Amino acid sequence: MEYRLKAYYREGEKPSALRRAGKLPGVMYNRHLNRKVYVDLVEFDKVFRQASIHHVIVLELPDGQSLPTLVRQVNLDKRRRRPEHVDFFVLSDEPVEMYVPLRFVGTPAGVRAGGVLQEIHRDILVKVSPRNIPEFIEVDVSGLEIGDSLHASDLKLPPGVELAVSPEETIAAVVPPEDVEKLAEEAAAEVAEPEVIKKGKEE
Amino acid sequence: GSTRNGRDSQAKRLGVKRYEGQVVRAGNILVRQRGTRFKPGKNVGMGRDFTLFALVDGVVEFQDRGRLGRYVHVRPL
Amino acid sequence: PRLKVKLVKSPIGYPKDQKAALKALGLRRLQQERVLEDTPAIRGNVEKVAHLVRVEVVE
Amino acid sequence: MLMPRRMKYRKQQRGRLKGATKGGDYVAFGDYGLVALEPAWITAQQIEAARVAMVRHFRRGGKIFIRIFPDKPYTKKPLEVRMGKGKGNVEGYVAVVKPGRVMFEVAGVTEEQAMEALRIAGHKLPIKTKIVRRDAYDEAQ
Amino acid sequence: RLTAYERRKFRVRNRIKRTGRLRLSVFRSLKHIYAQIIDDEKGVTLVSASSLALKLKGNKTEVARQVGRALAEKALALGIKQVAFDRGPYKYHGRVKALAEGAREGGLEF
RNA sequence: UCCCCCGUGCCCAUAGCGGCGUGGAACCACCCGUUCCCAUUCCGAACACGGAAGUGAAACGCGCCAGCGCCGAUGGUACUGGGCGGGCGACCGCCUGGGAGAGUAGGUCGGUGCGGGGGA
RNA sequence: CGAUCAACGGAUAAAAGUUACCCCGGGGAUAACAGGCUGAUCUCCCCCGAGCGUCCACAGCGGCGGGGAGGUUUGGCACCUCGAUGUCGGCUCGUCGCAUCCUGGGGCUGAAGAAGGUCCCAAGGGUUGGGCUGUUCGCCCAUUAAAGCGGCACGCGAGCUG
RNA sequence: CGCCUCCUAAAAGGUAACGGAGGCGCCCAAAGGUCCCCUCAGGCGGGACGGAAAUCCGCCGGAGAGCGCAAGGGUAGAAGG
RNA sequence: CUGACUGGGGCCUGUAGAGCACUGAUAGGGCUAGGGGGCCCACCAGCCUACCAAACCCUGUCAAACUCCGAAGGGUCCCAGGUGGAGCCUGGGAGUGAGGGCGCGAGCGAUAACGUCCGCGUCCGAGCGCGGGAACAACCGAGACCGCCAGCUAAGGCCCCCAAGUCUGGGCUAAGUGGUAAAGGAUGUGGCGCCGCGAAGACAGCCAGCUGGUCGAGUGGCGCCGCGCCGAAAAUGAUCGGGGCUUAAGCCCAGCGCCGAAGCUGCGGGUCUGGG
Ligand SMILES: NC(=[NH2+])NCCC[C@H](N)C(=O)O
Ligand SMILES: [Mg+2]
Ligand SMILES: [Mg+2]
Ligand SMILES: [Mg+2]
Ligand SMILES: [Mg+2]
Ligand SMILES: [Mg+2]
Ligand SMILES: [Mg+2]
Ligand SMILES: [Mg+2]
Ligand SMILES: [Mg+2]
Ligand SMILES: [Mg+2]
Ligand SMILES: [Mg+2]
Ligand SMILES: [Mg+2]
Ligand SMILES: [Mg+2]
Ligand SMILES: [Mg+2]
Ligand SMILES: [Mg+2]
Ligand SMILES: [Mg+2]
Ligand SMILES: [Mg+2]
Ligand SMILES: [Mg+2]
Ligand SMILES: [Mg+2]
Ligand SMILES: [Mg+2]
Ligand SMILES: [Mg+2]
Ligand SMILES: [Mg+2]
Ligand SMILES: [Mg+2]
Ligand SMILES: [Mg+2]
Ligand SMILES: [Mg+2]
Ligand SMILES: [Mg+2]
Ligand SMILES: [Mg+2]
Ligand SMILES: [Mg+2]
Ligand SMILES: [Mg+2]
Ligand SMILES: [Mg+2]
Ligand SMILES: [Mg+2]
Ligand SMILES: [Mg+2]
Ligand SMILES: [Mg+2]
Ligand SMILES: [Mg+2]
Ligand SMILES: [Mg+2]
Ligand SMILES: [Mg+2]
Ligand SMILES: [Mg+2]
Ligand SMILES: [Mg+2]
Ligand SMILES: [Mg+2]
Ligand SMILES: [Mg+2]
Ligand SMILES: [Mg+2]
Ligand SMILES: [Mg+2]
Ligand SMILES: [Mg+2]
Ligand SMILES: [Mg+2]
Ligand SMILES: [Mg+2]
Ligand SMILES: [Mg+2]
Ligand SMILES: [Mg+2]
Ligand SMILES: [Mg+2]
Ligand SMILES: [Mg+2]
Ligand SMILES: [Mg+2]
Ligand SMILES: [Mg+2]
Ligand SMILES: [Mg+2]
Ligand SMILES: [Mg+2]
Ligand SMILES: [Mg+2]
Ligand SMILES: [Mg+2]
Ligand SMILES: [Mg+2]
Ligand SMILES: [Mg+2]
Ligand SMILES: [Mg+2]
Ligand SMILES: [Mg+2]
Ligand SMILES: [Mg+2]
Ligand SMILES: [Mg+2]
Ligand SMILES: [Mg+2]
Ligand SMILES: [Mg+2]
Ligand SMILES: [Mg+2]
Ligand SMILES: [Mg+2]
Ligand SMILES: [Mg+2]
Ligand SMILES: [Mg+2]
Ligand SMILES: [Mg+2]
Ligand SMILES: [Mg+2]
Ligand SMILES: [Mg+2]
Ligand SMILES: [Mg+2]
Ligand SMILES: [Mg+2]
Ligand SMILES: [Mg+2]
Ligand SMILES: [Mg+2]
Ligand SMILES: [Mg+2]
Ligand SMILES: [Mg+2]
Ligand SMILES: [Mg+2]
Ligand SMILES: [Mg+2]
Ligand SMILES: [Mg+2]
Ligand SMILES: [Mg+2]
Ligand SMILES: [Mg+2]
Ligand SMILES: [Mg+2]
Ligand SMILES: [Mg+2]
Ligand SMILES: [Mg+2]
Ligand SMILES: [Mg+2]
Ligand SMILES: [Mg+2]
Ligand SMILES: [Mg+2]
Ligand SMILES: [Mg+2]
Ligand SMILES: [Mg+2]
Ligand SMILES: [Mg+2]
Ligand SMILES: [Mg+2]
Ligand SMILES: [Mg+2]
Ligand SMILES: [Mg+2]
Ligand SMILES: [Mg+2]
Ligand SMILES: [Mg+2]
Ligand SMILES: [Mg+2]
Ligand SMILES: [Mg+2]
Ligand SMILES: [Mg+2]
Ligand SMILES: [Mg+2]
Ligand SMILES: [Mg+2]
Ligand SMILES: [Mg+2]
Ligand SMILES: [Mg+2]
Ligand SMILES: [Mg+2]
Ligand SMILES: [Mg+2]
Ligand SMILES: [Mg+2]
Ligand SMILES: [Mg+2]
Ligand SMILES: [Mg+2]
Ligand SMILES: [Mg+2]
Ligand SMILES: [Mg+2]
Ligand SMILES: [Mg+2]
Ligand SMILES: [Mg+2]
Ligand SMILES: [Mg+2]
Ligand SMILES: [Mg+2]
Ligand SMILES: [Mg+2]
Ligand SMILES: [Mg+2]
Ligand SMILES: [Mg+2]
Ligand SMILES: [Mg+2]
Ligand SMILES: [Mg+2]
Ligand SMILES: [Mg+2]
Ligand SMILES: [Mg+2]
Ligand SMILES: [Mg+2]
Ligand SMILES: [Mg+2]
Ligand SMILES: [Mg+2]
Ligand SMILES: [Mg+2]
Ligand SMILES: [Mg+2]
Ligand SMILES: [Mg+2]
Ligand SMILES: [Mg+2]
Ligand SMILES: [Mg+2]
Ligand SMILES: [Mg+2]
Ligand SMILES: [Mg+2]
Ligand SMILES: [Mg+2]
Ligand SMILES: [Mg+2]
Ligand SMILES: [Mg+2]
Ligand SMILES: [Mg+2]
Ligand SMILES: [Mg+2]
Ligand SMILES: [Mg+2]
Ligand SMILES: [Mg+2]
Ligand SMILES: [Mg+2]
Ligand SMILES: [Mg+2]
Ligand SMILES: [Mg+2]
Ligand SMILES: [Mg+2]
Ligand SMILES: [Mg+2]
Ligand SMILES: [Mg+2]
Ligand SMILES: [Mg+2]
Ligand SMILES: [Mg+2]
Ligand SMILES: [Mg+2]
Ligand SMILES: [Mg+2]
Ligand SMILES: [Mg+2]
Ligand SMILES: [Mg+2]
Ligand SMILES: [Mg+2]
Ligand SMILES: [Mg+2]
Ligand SMILES: [Mg+2]
Ligand SMILES: [Mg+2]
Ligand SMILES: [Mg+2]
Ligand SMILES: [Mg+2]
Ligand SMILES: [Mg+2]
Ligand SMILES: [Mg+2]
Ligand SMILES: [Mg+2]
Ligand SMILES: [Mg+2]
Ligand SMILES: [Mg+2]
Ligand SMILES: [Mg+2]
Ligand SMILES: [Mg+2]
Ligand SMILES: [Mg+2]
Ligand SMILES: [Mg+2]
Ligand SMILES: [Mg+2]
Ligand SMILES: [Mg+2]
Ligand SMILES: [Mg+2]
Ligand SMILES: [Mg+2]
Ligand SMILES: [Mg+2]
Ligand SMILES: [Mg+2]
Ligand SMILES: [Mg+2]
Ligand SMILES: [Mg+2]
Ligand SMILES: [Mg+2]
Ligand SMILES: [Mg+2]
Ligand SMILES: [Mg+2]
Ligand SMILES: [Mg+2]
Ligand SMILES: [Mg+2]
Ligand SMILES: [Mg+2]
Ligand SMILES: [Mg+2]
Ligand SMILES: [Mg+2]
Ligand SMILES: [Mg+2]
Ligand SMILES: [Mg+2]
Ligand SMILES: [Mg+2]
Ligand SMILES: [Mg+2]
Ligand SMILES: [Mg+2]
Ligand SMILES: [Mg+2]
Ligand SMILES: [Mg+2]
Ligand SMILES: [Mg+2]
Ligand SMILES: [Mg+2]
Ligand SMILES: [Mg+2]
Ligand SMILES: [Mg+2]
Ligand SMILES: [Mg+2]
Ligand SMILES: [Mg+2]
Ligand SMILES: [Mg+2]
Ligand SMILES: [Mg+2]
Ligand SMILES: [Mg+2]
Ligand SMILES: [Mg+2]
Ligand SMILES: [Mg+2]
Ligand SMILES: [Mg+2]
């Protein structure tokens, strides 16, 4: 659907201090504005885990406003794997590029043969009107064999949405599964030493 | 156990010898270099090993002219 | 304004450039108080050795 | 097992293991991941042993993504020699691994199937690990 | 992606500015032939002369010689005496050569 | 001083590639010839000379389009001069001053100095 | 102009070996013995649970890999001792450790019984005589409740042997 | 064991180990001075013998070629032909 | 007056970090010359590939000798503060040219050594003078001219040995953890979350034959944080320095007071230098 999230303005307070208070710092911007903001970590998590960069988020500001935004970029703590910064993109009447979920409807024939569906793109980048945001986009993978694949070209689009990636871009494939029978022959494969790219009168 | 390595060459002590804003006399060496990292500019000649030397008394100036490279100038006093 | 700088922690074991700073400030003995004209040059040293000293603003 | 097919230079200085991961810190292929909690040189023998554990668990099915590669040559002087007489010989290759990196990912397998395979493989590794699943946080990277 | 014309033009001009003199540059079109003396130190033209501005006649060679003298006369009046001949992409020959020889006849120093 | 063109610099891709459009009065260009100067390791293709029937087709100049190229914040972060703590370590934190890179929003189909030729 | 004076700032124009027959001045600035530090190597104990065990991952075992302990092996280092720290093995005399060979006490067993396997507790005592070789070690004979493994400067030469 | 190039070298210079890697002990009478021209590798397409590659034609191609020999710096607005 | 150091300003740089545009490496996928393989052919090609895979493209990465980027810093010149056992010039006299620990940055070694070889700093050397660390050159504190039965502090401390708190307020720990160790294992304890399932009667069970029934309030998993438990075997007699300590005399957070050096102060004295 469409989710709501309370956001507060921030000034000279330290991002370090905010995060320790349980508040996840971020910024709000578009071609017109640019405001330093902070949300609550635990609240934002609740929203974002479903919303993501796919659904619109309305930001209830304390000045009384309510800006409808998309999350454009999230910054993770590479050590702790936690969010440390949020980019809220203030949406306006003009079209905007964004990522739109894909649903792979159907059970591939390769999957019946034991294969595995590798969902390369679990969403797709699309130029579209803000009023025109699809909940998802269906894809028929039922006709996929080991090892066949679909591309963004094979994506049948809803009205008003335009592809922002190369039609050549592969999006999903069905690949052979791990097998213990492969272990014996994989183990029997003897490896020759790494040759050296040389320097000088050899190179 | 032995090695075929172990060699190296005497350091050549290259680089800029006078920086911008520094007063130099006619003949003062300004840049020591391999090839033309810096190029001779106003009142500055170049030696057979790309050595940049002040042609006149004055003050050094550097200017970076993008795709044209970097240049060293001596401004007369 | 003037600065009243007081040496309160020994420079022993700290880099020679920090010992030089105290010399510029004129601080030679522990617990010694010196009053300095608050200029940028004087302030830089007083801040270089801020972990050895105690500054109070006066005048 | 995992080693470069060729290299410009045969031996490599040891370097350092300071800081959190450079990149590769988010799930990017499969459904579930195994992430390193502390830094190490993870040997090719370990990687392969950690892999085999998982495929053995799946028996048939699943897909294993190996997101680390041992390109760093490990050197060791012969037994009982003294210091000097040059650098040692290459005896194996390791992959430098700093805290936070997703080392392994599985896909196309039930949750309990992934939890166990990644745990078992976790035991073949010389470091502490953490099992993780794909988030929107991962999708946004 | 440069052309033999551009490179030829560049190569001979860089050589001229290096000597640091005032440069007598010469453009030579299909009908006309212009000439200006430039201070590349300041990026300023100091004295001009051309067939198009002198409304000159028939044979382009004989015309050039005239614009050459024209330039020199206007030149010395300004205190300019010595100068360097920028032959541009044009071989010192015929029309251009004639323009130069005219400037010389007029008392210009090069 | 304003407009267009021919020169010549500067800034050094926000100036580029691709696409489209437009200009020949003037200027430039291609163009017409190869007698003469001069020329082709062969070729008047190039360089060069003498010209002025044609055409702005190629070139070039001026516009327009963001598919690529190029520029690119704010915010956060890594790293760090200096001051401190923690771990047996690999390593990990704090204060203060400095603060990237990637990426995001977005910018861009140039700006400008001198001299001429033409126009208002 | 004559330099592989290439040991390339180039002792002479001109030069190799050997000493268990040896000597002097020096060094623990530097090796060999021991100790120390380290623990790669070694010995031992764990983690994981592929797989074996008719059946059954764990009675007994434990692929590929992972973490440690010890300080008995071979080493690395070169820190006290080179105005001396006597170096193997035996004999003698012991004393400690316990990761226990036996005896005592236990749980599990693929423990019918008897006898074994495996782990846990336990250092009180015990732990034989011979043949080979300098041997420690090891093989072998005949027995045994058992014929334990290590530390003590590989304990012990101002105690002996040699 | 002297000399040259790169790294180690901690963004001035310098910096060690029986640390990681290669080179030199020549050469050129043009491979030198100057003046005047010329611009590569590679890719696609086209062309008797002609081939992956001989020579020719076209389009694209900022330099990835070339510069006697190692490496680095440099370099077509030439130092290349 | 030029010095170390410092303030401003310009210029030089290619490390930390990061990046993949070059040189190489690289996982998977896509696309696609080459082979391999199969149906198919000798008559010259087809076609399919759950095969090995070039170039290219996408997602994700690695590099001392890779860099499209690129700091903090550092070097240098200028102006300014800086009068210091500062600096510059000529000359006389040396000694040293075995260093070592420690912190940070590297190589070597085994992400060993009271290891080794460089770099920047420091201390010991020469401060084996002083307080702290049980003891201990280089760890913390501090640069000892002499005297005092005076005062203030530094590190570290204040139950007794032993100078000063059995000091105050909040919390944890029951292991003497504190008072040496890892993978891994666990209904230890306290504390924050997160899912289920429950008076549409849950869970435990107590029954009749998984249903109900029976009672009448919770119950069952995940994960994170603090402090503890196991894993924990070595050789003369034991121990955290000892005694001894459990709402501590342990650990974490916050305070007030004291004790404590040859540091600082007070008083007196010496010597040299500078100035009256
Ligand atoms: N402000 C600074 N320069 N910080 C230094 C960063 C490195 C430091 N050792 C740390 O762990 O944080
Ligand atoms: Mg959270
Ligand atoms: Mg060998
Ligand atoms: Mg050798
Ligand atoms: Mg040198
Ligand atoms: Mg030399
Ligand atoms: Mg050297
Ligand atoms: Mg060098
Ligand atoms: Mg330089
Ligand atoms: Mg010269
Ligand atoms: Mg400037
Ligand atoms: Mg200048
Ligand atoms: Mg101190
Ligand atoms: Mg002092
Ligand atoms: Mg200290
Ligand atoms: Mg300092
Ligand atoms: Mg400094
Ligand atoms: Mg004092
Ligand atoms: Mg104070
Ligand atoms: Mg290793
Ligand atoms: Mg190594
Ligand atoms: Mg040896
Ligand atoms: Mg070595
Ligand atoms: Mg080695
Ligand atoms: Mg190995
Ligand atoms: Mg890593
Ligand atoms: Mg592990
Ligand atoms: Mg990315
Ligand atoms: Mg100008
Ligand atoms: Mg123009
Ligand atoms: Mg265009
Ligand atoms: Mg037209
Ligand atoms: Mg016309
Ligand atoms: Mg017309
Ligand atoms: Mg003729
Ligand atoms: Mg004629
Ligand atoms: Mg001729
Ligand atoms: Mg013609
Ligand atoms: Mg022409
Ligand atoms: Mg046209
Ligand atoms: Mg033209
Ligand atoms: Mg056009
Ligand atoms: Mg626009
Ligand atoms: Mg950017
Ligand atoms: Mg910023
Ligand atoms: Mg620091
Ligand atoms: Mg940090
Ligand atoms: Mg900071
Ligand atoms: Mg700051
Ligand atoms: Mg940026
Ligand atoms: Mg453009
Ligand atoms: Mg212009
Ligand atoms: Mg104008
Ligand atoms: Mg005009
Ligand atoms: Mg001779
Ligand atoms: Mg010699
Ligand atoms: Mg000799
Ligand atoms: Mg002699
Ligand atoms: Mg001689
Ligand atoms: Mg002789
Ligand atoms: Mg001889
Ligand atoms: Mg000799
Ligand atoms: Mg002898
Ligand atoms: Mg003899
Ligand atoms: Mg004899
Ligand atoms: Mg004999
Ligand atoms: Mg004798
Ligand atoms: Mg002797
Ligand atoms: Mg010694
Ligand atoms: Mg020696
Ligand atoms: Mg010796
Ligand atoms: Mg010895
Ligand atoms: Mg030895
Ligand atoms: Mg001994
Ligand atoms: Mg020894
Ligand atoms: Mg001893
Ligand atoms: Mg030891
Ligand atoms: Mg070991
Ligand atoms: Mg050990
Ligand atoms: Mg154990
Ligand atoms: Mg079985
Ligand atoms: Mg069983
Ligand atoms: Mg099984
Ligand atoms: Mg077992
Ligand atoms: Mg095994
Ligand atoms: Mg281990
Ligand atoms: Mg082991
Ligand atoms: Mg020992
Ligand atoms: Mg021993
Ligand atoms: Mg040894
Ligand atoms: Mg030993
Ligand atoms: Mg040795
Ligand atoms: Mg020794
Ligand atoms: Mg010795
Ligand atoms: Mg010794
Ligand atoms: Mg030594
Ligand atoms: Mg002695
Ligand atoms: Mg001795
Ligand atoms: Mg004696
Ligand atoms: Mg003695
Ligand atoms: Mg026992
Ligand atoms: Mg028994
Ligand atoms: Mg028993
Ligand atoms: Mg029985
Ligand atoms: Mg029985
Ligand atoms: Mg039993
Ligand atoms: Mg006993
Ligand atoms: Mg006993
Ligand atoms: Mg015994
Ligand atoms: Mg006998
Ligand atoms: Mg034997
Ligand atoms: Mg018996
Ligand atoms: Mg028995
Ligand atoms: Mg016996
Ligand atoms: Mg002995
Ligand atoms: Mg013994
Ligand atoms: Mg004796
Ligand atoms: Mg003996
Ligand atoms: Mg003895
Ligand atoms: Mg003995
Ligand atoms: Mg004795
Ligand atoms: Mg004898
Ligand atoms: Mg030599
Ligand atoms: Mg260097
Ligand atoms: Mg350097
Ligand atoms: Mg360097
Ligand atoms: Mg440096
Ligand atoms: Mg210098
Ligand atoms: Mg020639
Ligand atoms: Mg040459
Ligand atoms: Mg040449
Ligand atoms: Mg070609
Ligand atoms: Mg062809
Ligand atoms: Mg043919
Ligand atoms: Mg051909
Ligand atoms: Mg090149
Ligand atoms: Mg060669
Ligand atoms: Mg002064
Ligand atoms: Mg000065
Ligand atoms: Mg100065
Ligand atoms: Mg300064
Ligand atoms: Mg500066
Ligand atoms: Mg790096
Ligand atoms: Mg690359
Ligand atoms: Mg990318
Ligand atoms: Mg790195
Ligand atoms: Mg890297
Ligand atoms: Mg480097
Ligand atoms: Mg680098
Ligand atoms: Mg940039
Ligand atoms: Mg840029
Ligand atoms: Mg800077
Ligand atoms: Mg500086
Ligand atoms: Mg001054
Ligand atoms: Mg002095
Ligand atoms: Mg002095
Ligand atoms: Mg003297
Ligand atoms: Mg004397
Ligand atoms: Mg004397
Ligand atoms: Mg000496
Ligand atoms: Mg010496
Ligand atoms: Mg020495
Ligand atoms: Mg020494
Ligand atoms: Mg040394
Ligand atoms: Mg530290
Ligand atoms: Mg170090
Ligand atoms: Mg190394
Ligand atoms: Mg280890
Ligand atoms: Mg040492
Ligand atoms: Mg060390
Ligand atoms: Mg070390
Ligand atoms: Mg030192
Ligand atoms: Mg001494
Ligand atoms: Mg001391
Ligand atoms: Mg001292
Ligand atoms: Mg003490
Ligand atoms: Mg002491
Ligand atoms: Mg004490
Ligand atoms: Mg004492
Ligand atoms: Mg001590
Ligand atoms: Mg010590
Ligand atoms: Mg007091
Ligand atoms: Mg205190
Ligand atoms: Mg105490
Ligand atoms: Mg207290
Ligand atoms: Mg007592
Ligand atoms: Mg007391
Ligand atoms: Mg109390
Ligand atoms: Mg216990
Ligand atoms: Mg205790
Ligand atoms: Mg204890
Ligand atoms: Mg643990
Ligand atoms: Mg627990
Ligand atoms: Mg229960
Ligand atoms: Mg324990
Ligand atoms: Mg309390
Ligand atoms: Mg005193
Ligand atoms: Mg007094
Ligand atoms: Mg004095």
PDB file of all heavy atoms in Angstrom, chain G residues 145-147:
ATOM      1  P     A G 145      50.096 -63.009  38.895  1.00  0.00           P
ATOM      2  OP1   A G 145      49.849 -62.989  40.358  1.00  0.00           O
ATOM      3  OP2   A G 145      49.675 -64.184  38.090  1.00  0.00           O
ATOM      4  O5'   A G 145      49.492 -61.690  38.235  1.00  0.00           O
ATOM      5  C5'   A G 145      48.099 -61.530  38.019  1.00  0.00           C
ATOM      6  C4'   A G 145      47.718 -60.072  38.028  1.00  0.00           C
ATOM      7  O4'   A G 145      47.859 -59.552  39.366  1.00  0.00           O
ATOM      8  C3'   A G 145      48.577 -59.165  37.163  1.00  0.00           C
ATOM      9  O3'   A G 145      48.078 -59.096  35.842  1.00  0.00           O
ATOM     10  C2'   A G 145      48.522 -57.817  37.872  1.00  0.00           C
ATOM     11  O2'   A G 145      47.405 -57.075  37.417  1.00  0.00           O
ATOM     12  C1'   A G 145      48.282 -58.212  39.332  1.00  0.00           C
ATOM     13  N9    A G 145      49.461 -58.085  40.211  1.00  0.00           N
ATOM     14  C8    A G 145      50.394 -59.053  40.450  1.00  0.00           C
ATOM     15  N7    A G 145      51.316 -58.699  41.312  1.00  0.00           N
ATOM     16  C5    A G 145      50.958 -57.418  41.690  1.00  0.00           C
ATOM     17  C6    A G 145      51.548 -56.506  42.583  1.00  0.00           C
ATOM     18  N6    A G 145      52.668 -56.764  43.276  1.00  0.00           N
ATOM     19  N1    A G 145      50.948 -55.303  42.729  1.00  0.00           N
ATOM     20  C2    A G 145      49.838 -55.054  42.023  1.00  0.00           C
ATOM     21  N3    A G 145      49.194 -55.837  41.156  1.00  0.00           N
ATOM     22  C4    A G 145      49.811 -57.024  41.025  1.00  0.00           C
ATOM     23  P     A G 146      49.002 -59.493  34.600  1.00  0.00           P
ATOM     24  OP1   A G 146      48.134 -59.755  33.421  1.00  0.00           O
ATOM     25  OP2   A G 146      49.951 -60.531  35.063  1.00  0.00           O
ATOM     26  O5'   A G 146      49.812 -58.161  34.296  1.00  0.00           O
ATOM     27  C5'   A G 146      49.134 -56.970  33.931  1.00  0.00           C
ATOM     28  C4'   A G 146      49.932 -55.745  34.300  1.00  0.00           C
ATOM     29  O4'   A G 146      50.055 -55.667  35.739  1.00  0.00           O
ATOM     30  C3'   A G 146      51.366 -55.692  33.793  1.00  0.00           C
ATOM     31  O3'   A G 146      51.447 -55.202  32.464  1.00  0.00           O
ATOM     32  C2'   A G 146      52.056 -54.774  34.802  1.00  0.00           C
ATOM     33  O2'   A G 146      51.891 -53.411  34.445  1.00  0.00           O
ATOM     34  C1'   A G 146      51.265 -55.041  36.088  1.00  0.00           C
ATOM     35  N9    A G 146      51.993 -55.882  37.056  1.00  0.00           N
ATOM     36  C8    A G 146      52.352 -57.195  36.948  1.00  0.00           C
ATOM     37  N7    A G 146      52.986 -57.656  37.996  1.00  0.00           N
ATOM     38  C5    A G 146      53.046 -56.573  38.854  1.00  0.00           C
ATOM     39  C6    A G 146      53.597 -56.406  40.134  1.00  0.00           C
ATOM     40  N6    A G 146      54.216 -57.381  40.803  1.00  0.00           N
ATOM     41  N1    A G 146      53.483 -55.196  40.719  1.00  0.00           N
ATOM     42  C2    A G 146      52.854 -54.229  40.049  1.00  0.00           C
ATOM     43  N3    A G 146      52.300 -54.264  38.840  1.00  0.00           N
ATOM     44  C4    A G 146      52.429 -55.479  38.291  1.00  0.00           C
ATOM     45  P     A G 147      51.535 -56.202  31.205  1.00  0.00           P
ATOM     46  OP1   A G 147      50.994 -55.505  30.013  1.00  0.00           O
ATOM     47  OP2   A G 147      50.998 -57.527  31.597  1.00  0.00           O
ATOM     48  O5'   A G 147      53.094 -56.392  30.958  1.00  0.00           O
ATOM     49  C5'   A G 147      53.914 -55.299  30.555  1.00  0.00           C
ATOM     50  C4'   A G 147      54.447 -54.543  31.747  1.00  0.00           C
ATOM     51  O4'   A G 147      54.451 -55.416  32.908  1.00  0.00           O
ATOM     52  C3'   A G 147      55.867 -54.009  31.615  1.00  0.00           C
ATOM     53  O3'   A G 147      55.954 -52.783  32.331  1.00  0.00           O
ATOM     54  C2'   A G 147      56.692 -55.072  32.331  1.00  0.00           C
ATOM     55  O2'   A G 147      57.914 -54.607  32.852  1.00  0.00           O
ATOM     56  C1'   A G 147      55.752 -55.484  33.452  1.00  0.00           C
ATOM     57  N9    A G 147      55.970 -56.847  33.935  1.00  0.00           N
ATOM     58  C8    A G 147      56.026 -58.016  33.216  1.00  0.00           C
ATOM     59  N7    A G 147      56.234 -59.086  33.948  1.00  0.00           N
ATOM     60  C5    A G 147      56.316 -58.577  35.238  1.00  0.00           C
ATOM     61  C6    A G 147      56.525 -59.186  36.486  1.00  0.00           C
ATOM     62  N6    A G 147      56.697 -60.497  36.653  1.00  0.00           N
ATOM     63  N1    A G 147      56.551 -58.391  37.575  1.00  0.00           N
ATOM     64  C2    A G 147      56.376 -57.074  37.413  1.00  0.00           C
ATOM     65  N3    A G 147      56.169 -56.379  36.297  1.00  0.00           N
ATOM     66  C4    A G 147      56.149 -57.203  35.240  1.00  0.00           C
TER      67        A G 147
END
